[PDB]
């Protein structure tokens, strides 16, 4: 609803370090839809416990490969456009 379905359903090619992060949570291809990139990023965040019960909508990614890719120590999962922009920086 923040991001149009057509944009979510577009095939993208992750840059190599984003691909490394996706491959770490079982993703086995060179290209994905934006929606699949976001799914695997979700799986990664939940696996590495980059969250906190005190602030349940904040990803805490400082000193993690995710924080290096996105250029921030933390971000809000409610800011979908800002998150898409951070992912576009990591697509070929």
Q: Which parts of this chain interact with ligand TUZ (CB under 6 A)?
A: 38-39, 41-43, 45-46, 51, 56-57, 59, 77, 80, 83
Closest CB 17 distance from ligand TUZ, rounded Å: 15
What does the angle CA 36 – CA 23 – CA 33 come to, to the nearest 5 degrees? 20
- List helix spans (H) across the chain: 5-8, 16-24, 34-47, 65-70, 80-88
Closest CB 57 distance from ligand TUZ, rounded Å: 5
Closest CB 30 distance from ligand TUZ, rounded Å: 20
Nearer to ligand TUZ, 22 or 41 (CB): 41
Sign of the CA dihedral running 52, 39, 48, 90: negative
């Amino acid at each position: 609803s923040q991001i149009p379905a057509s944009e979510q359903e577009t095939l993208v090619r992750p840059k190599p370090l984003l691909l490394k992060l996706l491959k770490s949570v079982g993703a086995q291809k060179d290209t994905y839809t934006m929606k699949e990139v976001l799914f695997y990023l979700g799986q990664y965040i939940m696996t590495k416990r980059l969250y906190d019960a005190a602030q349940q909508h904040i990803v805490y990614c400082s000193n993690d490969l995710l924080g290096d890719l996105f250029g921030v120590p933390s971000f809000s999962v409610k800011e979908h456009r800002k998150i898409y922009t951070m992912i576009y920086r990591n697509l070929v």
